[PDB]
Design a protein around this ligand. Structure first.
Ligand code: ZN
Length: 57
């Protein structure tokens, strides 16, 4: 199952891309974590390519 973490402040879960290992803010409204998750899965088009730098926090 795709790896997730909760940010230290507690306001945001992040999911790790199984290809590039960057952490992406978890898309809202997901019914489940998939077996593998990639930037390419992101409903947010700004964080859909592994080359996009990882957001802070
Ligand atoms: Zn990626």
């Amino acid at each position: 199952t795709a790896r997730s973490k909760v940010g230290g402040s507690g306001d945001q879960t992040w999911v790790q891309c199984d290809a590039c290992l960057k952490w992406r803010k978890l898309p809202d409204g997901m019914d489940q974590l998939p077996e593998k998750w990639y930037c390419s899965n992101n409903p947010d088009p700004q964080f859909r390519n592994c080359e996009v730098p990882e957001e802070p926090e």
